[PDB]
Amino acid sequence: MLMKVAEFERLFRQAAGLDVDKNDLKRVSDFLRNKLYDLLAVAERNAKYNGRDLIFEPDLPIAKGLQETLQEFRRMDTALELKPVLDALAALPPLDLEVAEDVRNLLPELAGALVVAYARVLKELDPALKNPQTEHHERAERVFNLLL
Amino acid sequence: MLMKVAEFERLFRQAAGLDVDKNDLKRVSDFLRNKLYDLLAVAERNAKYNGRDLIFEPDLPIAKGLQETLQEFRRMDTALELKPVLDALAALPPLDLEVAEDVRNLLPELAGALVVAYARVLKELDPALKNPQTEHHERAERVFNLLL
Ligand SMILES: [Ca+2]
Ligand SMILES: [Ca+2]
Q: What is the DSSP code string of chain A?
A: --S-HHHHHHHHHHHH-----HHHHHHHHHHHHHHHHHHHHHHHHHHHHTT-SEE-GGGS---HHHHHHHHHHHTT-----HHHHHHHHTTSPPPSSEEPHHHHHHHHHHHHHHHHHHHHHHHHHSTT-SS--HHHHHHHHHHHHHH-
Contact: A146, B45; criterion CB under 8 Å: no
Phi, psi of A62 (to 5 degrees): -100, 110
Q: Provide the H-helix boundaries in chain B.
A: 5-16, 22-49, 64-74, 82-89, 101-125, 134-147
Mutate to test the interface with B, among A40, A52, A120, A124 (most CBs of B within 10 A): A124
Chain B, window 5-64: residues with a beta carbon less than 8 angstroms from a chain A beta carbon: 35, 38-39, 41-42, 45-46, 49-50, 58, 60-64
DSSP B76: T
Contact: B39, A121; criterion CB under 8 Å: no
- Distance, in Å, from the CA atom of B120 to the CA atom of B104, rounded to the nearest integer, reads 25
Tally of CB atoms within 10 A around B131: 12
How far is C-alpha B113 from the chain's CA centre? 6
Which experiment gave this structure? Answer: X-ray
CATH assignment of B2-148? 1.10.20.10
* Pair B29, B137: CB distance under 8 Å: no
List all residues 6 or more positions away from A144 whose beta carbon is below 8 Å from its beta carbon: A31, A35, A117, A118, A121, B65, B147
* Pair A54, A47: CB distance under 8 Å: yes
Report domain extents, chain B: 2-148
Contact: B145, A62; criterion CB under 8 Å: no
* Pair A8, A22: CB distance under 8 Å: no
Q: Strand, coil or helix: what is B78?
A: coil
- Distance, in Å, from the CA atom of B17 to the CA atom of B99, rounded to the nearest integer, reads 34
Chain A, window 92-111: residues with a beta carbon less than 8 angstroms from a chain B beta carbon: none
Rg of chain A, C-alpha, whole Å: 15
* Pair A122, A136: CB distance under 8 Å: yes
DSSP B107: H
Q: How far is the CA of A143 from the centre of ligand 1 (A)?
A: 33
Resolution of this model in Å is: 1.9
Cα distances from A1 to residues A28, A82, A111, A119, in angstroms, run 9, 11, 11, 17
- Distance, in Å, from the CA atom of B133 to the CA atom of A135, rounded to the nearest integer, reads 25
Q: Which of A115, A119, A37, A141 is nearest to B120 (CA)?
A: A141
* Pair A12, A126: CB distance under 8 Å: no
